[PDB]
Amino acid sequence: GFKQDIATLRGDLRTYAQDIFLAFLNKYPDEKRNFKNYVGKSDQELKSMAKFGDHTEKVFNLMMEVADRATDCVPLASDASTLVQMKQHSGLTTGNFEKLFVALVEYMRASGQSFDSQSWDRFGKNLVSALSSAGMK
């Protein structure tokens, strides 16, 4: 289930994080509007760019914590508020997170592994709802 998937991802978190975020950027190339420095770079070039490696690592370290603190894939409202109030996220909207989780679910379904993709689909929808309630446009 969802809780075991958190353990699976955490057990190889750097590789999963970079692969899922790359899947996001390659499924939705226009999302580089928020990452101008990512333009004109292959996956392997991005993986050697410090700001990509560091942001991606932060994304998934904190996402696994938010998932871990969730009940039945519903995040804490306080976790959603913290995400909304992050300064570097000022230009984001719920659509950015929606797309991230569509790519993550697609990645899990395509993997060879026993991920509970339905739970991650719910988690992403419930996070988006919570971000909206917390003030994200």
Residues in touch with a copy of itself (CB under 8 A): 7, 10-14, 53-54, 57-58, 61-62, 64-65
| C-alpha angle 18-22-27 in degrees, rounded to nearest 5 | 155
79 in Cβ contact with 69 (< 8 Å): yes
Pick what 21 binds: a copy of itself, ligand F9G, ligand HEM, none; C-beta below 5 to 8 Å, kind-dependent. Answer: ligand F9G
Pick what 64 binds: a copy of itself, ligand F9G, ligand HEM, none; C-beta below 5 to 8 Å, kind-dependent. Answer: a copy of itself
Residue of 5, 18, 46, 96 interacting with ligand HEM (CB under 6 A): 96
d(CA 52, CA 75): 26
24 is an interface residue for ligand F9G by CB under 6 A: yes
**97 annotated as belonging to a binding site for a ligand:** yes
58 is an interface residue for ligand HEM by CB under 6 A: yes
d(CA 53, CA 48): 7
Pick what 12 binds: a copy of itself, ligand HEM, ligand F9G, none; C-beta below 5 to 8 Å, kind-dependent. Answer: a copy of itself
- 127: CB partners within 8 A, 6+ apart: 66, 75, 80, 97, 101
99 in Cβ contact with 30 (< 8 Å): no
Pick what 17 binds: a copy of itself, ligand HEM, ligand F9G, none; C-beta below 5 to 8 Å, kind-dependent. Answer: ligand F9G
Question: Would you state the structure tokens that stand for residue 63, as one six-digit string?
Answer: 């996402």
As annotated, the binding site includes: 36-37, 51, 55, 58, 88-89, 97
